[PDB]
Amino acid sequence: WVVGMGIVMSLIVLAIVFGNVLVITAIAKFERLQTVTNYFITSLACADLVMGLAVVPFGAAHILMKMWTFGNFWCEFWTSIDVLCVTASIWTLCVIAVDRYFAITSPFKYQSLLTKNKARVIILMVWIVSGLTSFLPIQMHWYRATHQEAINCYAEETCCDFFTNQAYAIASSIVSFYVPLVIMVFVYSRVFQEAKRQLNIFEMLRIDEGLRLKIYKDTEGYYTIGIGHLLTKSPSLNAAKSELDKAIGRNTNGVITKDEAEKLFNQDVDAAVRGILRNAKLKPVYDSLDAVRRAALINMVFQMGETGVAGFTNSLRMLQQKRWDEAAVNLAKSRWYNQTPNRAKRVITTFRTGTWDAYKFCLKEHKALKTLGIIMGTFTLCWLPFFIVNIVHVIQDNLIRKEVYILLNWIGYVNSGFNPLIYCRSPDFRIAFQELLCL
Ligand SMILES: CC(C)CCC[C@@H](C)[C@H]1CC[C@H]2[C@@H]3CC=C4C[C@@H](O)CC[C@]4(C)[C@H]3CC[C@]12C
Ligand SMILES: CC(C)CCC[C@@H](C)[C@H]1CC[C@H]2[C@@H]3CC=C4C[C@@H](O)CC[C@]4(C)[C@H]3CC[C@]12C
Ligand SMILES: CCCCCCCC/C=C\CCCCCCCC(=O)OC[C@H](O)CO
Ligand SMILES: CCCCCCCC/C=C\CCCCCCCC(=O)OC[C@H](O)CO
Ligand SMILES: CCCCCCCC/C=C\CCCCCCCC(=O)OC[C@H](O)CO
Ligand SMILES: CC(C)(C)NC[C@H](O)COc1nsnc1N1CCOCC1
Numbered sequence: 001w002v003v004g005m006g007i008v009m010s011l012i013v014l015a016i017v018f019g020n021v022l023v024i025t026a027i028a029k030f031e032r033l034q035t036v037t038n039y040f041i042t043s044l045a046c047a048d049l050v051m052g053l054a055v056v057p058f059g060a061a062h063i064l065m066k067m068w069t070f071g072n073f074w075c076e077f078w079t080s081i082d083v084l085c086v087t088a089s090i091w092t093l094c095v096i097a098v099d100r101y102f103a104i105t106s107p108f109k110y111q112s113l114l115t116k117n118k119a120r121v122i123i124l125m126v127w128i129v130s131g132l133t134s135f136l137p138i139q140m141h142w143y144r145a146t147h148q149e150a151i152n153c154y155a156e157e158t159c160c161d162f163f164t165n166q167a168y169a170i171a172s173s174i175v176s177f178y179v180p181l182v183i184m185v186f187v188y189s190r191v192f193q194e195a196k197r198q199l200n201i202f203e204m205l206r207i208d209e210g211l212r213l214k215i216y217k218d219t220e221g222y223y224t225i226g227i228g229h230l231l232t233k234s235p236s237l238n239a240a241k242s243e244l245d246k247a248i249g250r251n252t253n254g255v256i257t258k259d260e261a262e263k264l265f266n267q268d269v270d271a272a273v274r275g276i277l278r279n280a281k282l283k284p285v286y287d288s289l290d291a292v293r294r295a296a297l298i299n300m301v302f303q304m305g306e307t308g309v310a311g312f313t314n315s316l317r318m319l320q321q322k323r324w325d326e327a328a329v330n331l332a333k334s335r336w337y338n339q340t341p342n343r344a345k346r347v348i349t350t351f352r353t354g355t356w357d358a359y360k361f362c363l364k365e366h367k368a369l370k371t372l373g374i375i376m377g378t379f380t381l382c383w384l385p386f387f388i389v390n391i392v393h394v395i396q397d398n399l400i401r402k403e404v405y406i407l408l409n410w411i412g413y414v415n416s417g418f419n420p421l422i423y424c425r426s427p428d429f430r431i432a433f434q435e436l437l438c439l
Contacts, residue, residue: 002064009060012414016052019420020045026432033428036112036119037372040096041423043123044375047085047092048416055082056413063406068160075160076138083134084127086383086412087176091126093376094180097188100369104194110365133176143168161402169394177387184376192373195366196356201269201295204350205302207362208343211261215240215254219340225254226261228302229268272298275306282310288320296350303343304336319351328352364427371425378422382415 023045027038058078062068068075103112114122137143143164144154150163209228215237218224222233223240231243237254244252248260276282276298286294297319300309310316312334318327328348331337337344349358361370386408389400423429 006060006064009056009064012417013052013056013060016048016056016417019417020049020052022433022436023420023423023429024049025436026429029436030428030432033432034116036099036114036116037096037368039116039119039123040092040099041419043092043126044089044096045419047089048419050081051085051413051416054078055085056416059410059413062160067158069158070160072154072157078160079162080135080138083138083172083176084130085416087130087134088127089379090177090180090184090383091130092123093379094184094187095122095126096372097184097191097376100191100372101187101194104191104198104369109198110368130176133172137168137172143172166394169390173387173390177383181380181384185380188373188376191369195369196360199356199359199363199366201298202265203363204295204299204356204359205269206265207359208299208346209302211258213256213258213261215244225256227265227268229261229264268302269298272301272306276301279306279310281316282306285316285320288322290354292354292356293319293351296347299347299350300336303340324352324354368426371422374422374425375419378418379415382418383412386412 024042027033027042058070099112099114103110106113145163145165153159153161153163206227211227215223215225223231225231225244231240241254247264276286286297289297315327315330328351331348346358361367389405389408393400
């Protein structure tokens with residue numbers, strides 16, 4: 001039996017060290033991943049690396065041997081490092097949540113207001129302050145209990161059970177875990193709401209239209225470039241390049257920058273807007289719609305044209321009469337829904353609710369925010385039961401057992417190995433991992 005669990009704990013130790021070193025190396029090697037967000041992720045990965053190298057191995061030894069053979073010095077230093085890493089992780093995540101809040105509320109959406117040199121200082125202080133609040137109360141004996149069972153364990157070298165006084169157990173839990181948790185959960189819930197609120201048609205079209213810097217053929221087969229900007233309907237490749245050289249004003253050779261792609265995207269959206277106001281059929285429909293449904297109407301005009309969207313005589317009728325559910329059924333009863341289902345479904349669903357439920361976490365930066373949300377969420381689900389049980393044991397010290405306390409602590413220790421697997425979501429990290437593993 002002892003072996004069966006010893007192997008499991010060894011696979012945990014290895015998974016944490018392997019995965020976190022891989023995360024740290026990728027952010028330190030590849031310039032594309034050297035962003036302010038990934039600096040905090042590095043801080044988070046190092047906390048988990050110290051957890052897998054200096055905390056879990058000695059924790060596993062303490063359980064299987066049922067005693068502490070590392071002396072009274074390492075017992076306290078080990079406990080301090082354990083408390084440090086958890087504190088450093090939750091505060092780093094809180095800082096990430098705050099960083100992402102100020103990034104999305106500003107016009108430089110998804111870009112951190114903090115510079116790289118300032119971000120390193122934040123991290124440094126998050127480890128210095130967490131260093132003092134974790135080590136000092138343990139090294140200066142402010143944590144120690146005064147009852148007999150506890151004093152026997154402190155004197156005995158072979159005992160390393162973490163007995164604490166009621167004051168420390170509450171004060172440390174609130175300052176080290178609950179305060180940054182509540183703020184993180186409150187501040188990052190707003191981040192998901194700002195993402196769902198501030199996204200307009202410039203992101204809506206960018207998502208379902210895509211972006212390519214080179215000349216490609218659309219679903220219909222015509223030469224297109226950028227964010228669905230149709231160059232020509234002619235089957236000639238040089239005709240497409242000729243219309244591309246005309247539109248931009250230089251010899252592009254069928255290749256453009258992201259700037260030029262956005263400049264054309266602004267012109268196409270404005271031309272769609274103007275075209276709706278021009279067309280007598282689309283003109284009253286656009287006025288009767290709210291800011292979100294207007295974007296859904298411009299989306300259709302961007303894809304089919306003003307003349308094509310004017311064909312929906314029954315759909316346009318009911319969109320002005322506030323009959324969303326019926327108008328959405330008629331949009332499904334058209335060749336547009338049959339041709340491009342995934343896109344039409346999202347546009348129809350936008351007319352349905354009048355919200356952005358269909359475009360949730362579809363944009364690249366939104367998936368990046370969702371990933372960060374999973375990192376925070378997993379940390380909460382893995383550590384909250386331990387801390388809840390920690391405060392419950394202070395109130396009534398005869399409700400939770402020792403085995404239950406240690407088990408929930410290990411659900412928290414196994415959380416150190418989850419992050420690298422969760423980073424696979426990000427396309428930048430996948431490429432980076434399989435490059436370091438030489439695959
Ligand atoms: C020694 C044990 C107990 C814990 C101490 C680990 C400390 C020194 C580690 C953990 C995480 C670390 C930081 C993680 C990320 C960055 C950003 C990087 O671009 C420069 C260094 C910097 C700022 C690190 C400095 C050192 C750091 C604070
Ligand atoms: C007792 C043991 C666990 C303590 C050892 C802590 C180790 C893991 C710490 C100490 C100093 C650290 C490094 C300090 C500086 C950097 C540069 C940064 O660009 C990436 C993180 C990185 C590479 C850190 C990785 C982790 C590191 C090597
Ligand atoms: C995938 C699950 C496998 C089961 C778990 C066993 C993991 C192996 C254990 C420890 C390795 C620790 C060392 C970290 C890995 C180094 C590889 C790395 O990141 O590459 C370096 C890069 O090539 C430099 O340029
Ligand atoms: C214990 C003594 C330490 C006292 C110091 C802690 C005080 C902060 C407290 C709560 C807010 C938590 C978030 C704080 C981190 C801010 C993150 C950041 O810098 O925010 C990015 C923003 O863009 C910048 O303008
Ligand atoms: C029941 C509702 C849950 C209430 C939960 C109470 C948590 C209090 C949080 C912060 C106050 C301390 C200030 C920390 C520094 C500012 C952080 C910030 O930028 O937050 C913006 C805010 O999230 C945009 O609504
Ligand atoms: C109990 C033992 C062996 C130290 N494991 C420790 C935890 O995994 C890490 O605990 C903490 N991280 S930040 N704050 C804490 N605590 C939680 C327990 O009460 C004192 C302070």
